[PDB]
Ligand binder design. Structure first.
Ligand SMILES: *[C@@H]1O[C@H](CO)[C@@H](O[C@@H]2O[C@H](CO)[C@@H](O[C@@H]3O[C@H](CO[C@H]4O[C@H](CO[C@H]5O[C@H](CO)[C@@H](O)[C@H](O)[C@@H]5O)[C@@H](O)[C@H](O[C@H]5O[C@H](CO)[C@@H](O)[C@H](O)[C@@H]5O)[C@@H]4O)[C@@H](O)[C@H](O[C@H]4O[C@H](CO)[C@@H](O)[C@H](O)[C@@H]4O)[C@@H]3O)[C@H](O)[C@H]2NC(C)=O)[C@H](O)[C@H]1NC(C)=O
Ligand SMILES: *[C@@H]1O[C@H](CO)[C@@H](O[C@@H]2O[C@H](CO)[C@@H](O)[C@H](O)[C@H]2NC(C)=O)[C@H](O)[C@H]1NC(C)=O
Ligand SMILES: *[C@@H]1O[C@H](CO)[C@@H](O)[C@H](O)[C@H]1NC(C)=O
Ligand SMILES: *[C@@H]1O[C@H](CO)[C@@H](O)[C@H](O)[C@H]1NC(C)=O
Ligand SMILES: *[C@@H]1O[C@H](CO)[C@@H](O)[C@H](O)[C@H]1NC(C)=O
Ligand SMILES: *[C@@H]1O[C@H](CO)[C@@H](O)[C@H](O)[C@H]1NC(C)=O
Ligand SMILES: *[C@@H]1O[C@H](CO)[C@@H](O)[C@H](O)[C@H]1NC(C)=O
Lengths: 213, 122, 92, 41, 240, 48, 122
């Protein structure tokens, strides 16, 4: 897209943060109104700002807009956990539709740490009949939203059949993710135990299952 | 454009506010007829009476000193004047019209004239 | 950001109301009960004004124009009978 | 579903032609907020 | 203060056509433009066009001017100030990069310098463009596992493995159980099939008075699955 | 004022989308009748 | 304090003059009734007619160019406004109200408008 936003910006808790929105004169500011949207992934967006300064109904006064001749800006004051998400600007006139920007992901620093919740499930007996074997390692309520997952077969790494999802934001403003390990029934039965290790820069957690029990 | 009497009843309040003379013209112009004609001039003189006590007799629009209490409506300028019709507006402000009219005669005109006497007293 | 109330006179606003209507008909050349001696002549042209975008609820069954017309026809009938010959002696 | 014609009441005849009309009273007084103030005393 | 409800997700083969609907309520449908915006992984969010239910004037972005047809029905009045309506978008010559999420959105103001500006958005419609066929999921129980031994809490769920395409909806006890539900996003296997998991946290003491049933719906394949989660755990910490 | 519903398929009460206003109705003939209605106005499109 | 319609009929003229809107509101709002309603709007329009020819249509109070002839009353400001009621005042000035009204339309308004034409003539 020819309408560029700051790819990332960061602000501290209780502080303010500013997102930029600029591009060529063919799309930018003097003769074009600018609007701002909050757009969480996987959900419907919310209009916060339209016509430059003027904020949408019900929007808190924490949000403010400003447009210069060369670029436009959006300021979010008194940052909250829910403000940590993706934001888009649009350039438009009355008769001409939206041109969406490249997008900006906002990170809120100074937030409290959340301990990870790890749960590991073995393959079902109905699944062992099929005959396949999939271990499921579910992770929730961790912050910041970044994980690294490692699997082990009899205390030794595994590399075939590992699939891990990206981290996803929970309704409670914590994060979640999951990982799946596909195995053949012989590898499952031929080992003493399997393990799912979730590593975070602050703490590494290990959950272990065994085919014996 | 002139759309006629009540032509902008279904337009936005801002668009309708431009053609107040249109509604104003036809607003004034045996026993059944006579009783009806009396009722008509009676209602017209009632509204002109209210414009009188609000100091706005000769004008269609006048500004006031009463501030807009946000409890009445939480909308803004753009949302009121470019998204709503006078009809649905009058329905939303149907709990305050009596209240607002009372504040309208008292807050300003009942104090505009007292201050006028104390000011022109020299 | 400081808002003050403003008066508008002649706004397109109406409410449901019941009022006393009256008759109207073009003048013709006699003496039919409904027209009576006099009913106000109609305007040469009525102005039917379309109201775009306007949606209003109608109720033909709770309508008062019906009850008014009903009592009008009845009363007109009696107003036309008074001056004519009463056949009280015809009960022989 | 059996149908019989009736004429119980004479108003129904007026309803047949007055179904389309309705009476309303004009309330020409509207108050709305703008960023305007009257000349200060 | 109205709701926009869009049609369900669909899977279509590339080169085919699909018609998405957008039913409205809670406002005068005639007074606001209906915009259509999509979001794909390759191009991000992209505005497609809008149409006026009052006049029928439409404005399509040049990238979709030759493949999108927008139409509207006439509003069905409910009260004097509200009504119900429906708008449609028919998109043809589908390609793989057209896979994504589509939204309809109600305009901002009846008049001004941004009348059409999308303000009220629908829940979205997931469109998958692929040569691959629809595939139903296989549902397996997730035996209860201990969450807090001192607190007397546990977690149990259902595993939805190998389905295609997105999405799958999961409820508990026919929607009676909504508290403590945590449904996880799907994984994208190398085979091209999706798989996800759902877990609910409940007190460990609740075993003799409450039934836990996970209801899986995969509407693209028209399959419903009601699986009873076995409450007997194998976790020692929960066994205590 | 008098509001006149011009909705053809108007089923006897309800919201009328197309409405026009008049100070006086059209010429209504006071036909005294029973059962069948005589010399009246005809509904357009379908019978109502 | 708001004492109501005619609340300050028995107060001093100065105190009563503050609540003119109170008397102004209710001042406007089968055969016997109809004849009474016509009489009411007729009297109201008569007073509004007099305010018209005195150039004071939209106001409750207006100042004039007519000087106070001392033959009318020999009282002063303090004695009039802080010692008398409008009732007993109207009784004292009942020989001049016709005379004062005639001077009121002629001395000022019948010469305010002539001078207005000769002034706005350029
Ligand atoms: C009854 O209710 C309805 C709905 O509530 C209401 O209709 C809305 O009315 C409002 C105001 O009256 C309109 O809001 C304005 O719209 C102006 C016109 O829109 C222009 O742009 C349209 C899109 O143009 C693109 O697409 C076309 C192809 O379609 C292409 O050729 C163009 O180049 C461009 O790419 C266009 O379709 C539209 O054309 C229609 O209207 C014109 C008359 O304007 C007519 O000639 C056409 O035949 C056609 O019907 C038109 O060109 C818009 O310009 C305007 O913005 C200006 O004014 C504001 C101030 O109001 C300024 O701030 C701003 O800077 C601009 O100068 C404003 O946005 C709205 O569009 C209507 N439709 C809706 C909401 O769907 C009725 O008015 C109501 N009627 C009554 C009697 O109450
Ligand atoms: C009875 O119905 C006939 C039609 O069957 C009416 O005749 C038409 O009257 C209209 C005026 O309303 C004219 O425009 C048509 O040209 C007439 N039709 C024909 C075929 O000439 C007649 O008016 C009706 N009588 C009434 C209502 O008393
Ligand atoms: C719009 O309304 C909200 C709600 O009261 C208000 O807080 C806000 O300041 C208004 N915004 C504008 C741009 O006028
Ligand atoms: C505004 O409305 C509130 C109702 O909660 C009332 O208490 C208050 O006195 C009002 N304010 C003014 C200035 O009239
Ligand atoms: C008017 O008052 C009644 C009862 O006090 C309430 O039900 C209604 O919602 C009010 N109107 C508005 C517009 O708030
Ligand atoms: C005042 O009243 C006296 C009565 O004695 C009269 O002669 C005189 O003309 C009046 N003066 C004015 C200026 O009207
Ligand atoms: C009014 O005039 C009569 C006779 O001219 C006189 O008796 C009376 O006292 C006068 N009124 C006043 C207040 O002087």
């Amino acid at each position: 897209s020819v309408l560029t936003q700051s790819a990332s910006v960061s602000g501290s808790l209780g502080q303010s943060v500013t997102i930029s929105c600029t591009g060529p004169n063919s799309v930018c500011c003097s003769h074009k109104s600018i609007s701002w949207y909050q757009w969480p992934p996987g959900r419907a967006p919310t209009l916060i700002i339209y016509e430059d300064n003027e904020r949408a109904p019900g929007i808190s006064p924490r949000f403010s807009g400003y447009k210069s001749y060369w670029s436009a800006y959006l300021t979010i004051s008194d940052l909250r956990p829910e403000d940590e998400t993706t934001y888009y600007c649009c350039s438009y006139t009355h008769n001409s539709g939206c041109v969406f920007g490249t997008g900006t992901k906002v990170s809120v620093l100074g937030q409290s740490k959340a301990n990870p919740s790890v749960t590991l499930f073995p393959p079902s007996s109905e699944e062992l009949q099929a005959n396949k074997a999939t271990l499921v390692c579910l992770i929730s309520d961790f912050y910041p939203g970044a994980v690294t997952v490692a699997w082990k077969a009899d205390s030794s790494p595994v590399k075939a059949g590992v699939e891990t999802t990206t981290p996803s934001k929970q309704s409670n403003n914590k994060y979640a993710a999951s990982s799946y390990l596909s195995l053949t029934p012989e590898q499952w039965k031929s080992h003493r135990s399997y393990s799912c290790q979730v590593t975070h820069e602050g703490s590494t957690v290990e959950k272990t299952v065994a085919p014996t029990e | 454009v002139s759309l006629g009497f009540l032509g902008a009843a279904g337009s936005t309040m801002g668009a309708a506010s431009m053609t107040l003379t249109v509604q104003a013209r036809n607003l004034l112009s045996g026993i059944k007829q006579l009783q009806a004609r009396v009722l008509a001039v009676e209602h017209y003189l009632r509204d002109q009476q209210l414009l009188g006590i609000w100091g706005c007799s000769g004008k269609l629009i006048c500004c006031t000193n009463v501030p807009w209490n946000s409890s009445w409506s939480n909308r803004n300028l753009s949302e009121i004047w470019d998204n709503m019709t006078w009809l649905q507006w009058d329905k939303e402000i149907s709990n305050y019209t009596q209240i607002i009219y009372g504040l309208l005669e008292e807050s300003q005109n009942q104090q505009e004239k007292n201050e006028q006497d104390l000011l022109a007293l020299d | 950001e400081n808002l003050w109330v403003t008066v508008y006179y002649g706004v397109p606003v109406w409410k449901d109301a019941e009022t006393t209507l009256f008759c109207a008909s073009d003048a013709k050349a006699k003496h039919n009960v409904w027209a009576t001696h006099a009913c106000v002549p109609t305007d040469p042209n009525p102005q039917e004004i379309h109201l775009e975008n306007v949606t209003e609820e109608f109720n033909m069954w709770k309508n008062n124009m019906v009850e008014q017309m009903h009592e009008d026809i009845i009363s007109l009938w009696d107003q036309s009978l008074k001056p004519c010959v009463k056949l009280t002696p015809l009960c022989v | 579903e059996t149908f019989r014609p009736g004429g119980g009441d004479m108003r129904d005849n007026w309803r047949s032609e007055l179904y389309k009309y309705k009476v309303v009273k004009i309330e020409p007084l509207g108050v709305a907020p703008t960023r305007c103030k009257r000349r200060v005393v | 203060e109205g709701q926009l409800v869009q049609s369900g997700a669909e899977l279509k083969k590339p080169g085919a056509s699909v018609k998405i609907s957008c039913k409205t309520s809670g406002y005068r449908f005639n007074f606001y433009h209906i915009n259509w915006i999509r979001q794909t992984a390759g191009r991000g969010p992209e505005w497609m066009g809008w149409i006026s239910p009052y006049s029928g004037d439409k404005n399509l972005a040049p990238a979709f001017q030759d493949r999108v047809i927008m139409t509207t029905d006439t509003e069905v009045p409910v009260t004097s100030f509200t009504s119900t309506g429906a708008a449609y978008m028919e998109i043809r010559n589908l390609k793989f990069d057209d896979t994504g999420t589509y939204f309809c959105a109600k305009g901002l103001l009846r008049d001004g310098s941004s009348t059409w500006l999308p303000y009220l958005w629908g829940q979205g419609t997931l469109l998958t463009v692929s040569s691959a066929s629809t595939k139903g999921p296989s549902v397996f129980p997730l035996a209860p596992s201990s969450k807090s031994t001192s607190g007397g809490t546990a977690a149990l769920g259902c595993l939805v493995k190998d389905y295609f395409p997105e999405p799958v909806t999961v409820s508990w006890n026919s929607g009676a159980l909504t508290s403590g539900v945590h449904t996880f996003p799907a994984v994208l296997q190398s085979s091209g099939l999706y798989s996800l998991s759902s877990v609910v946290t409940v007190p460990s003491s609740s075993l003799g008075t409450q039934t836990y049933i996970c209801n899986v719906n995969h509407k693209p394949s028209n399959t419903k699955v009601d699986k009873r989660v076995e409450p007997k755990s194998c976790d020692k910490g929960l066994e205590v | 004022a008098i509001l006149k519903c011009k909705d053809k398929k108007f089923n006897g009460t309800g919201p009328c989308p197309s409405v026009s206003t008049v100070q006086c109705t059209h010429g209504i003939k006071p036909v005294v009748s029973t059962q069948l209605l005589l010399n009246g106005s005809l509904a357009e499109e379908e019978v109502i």
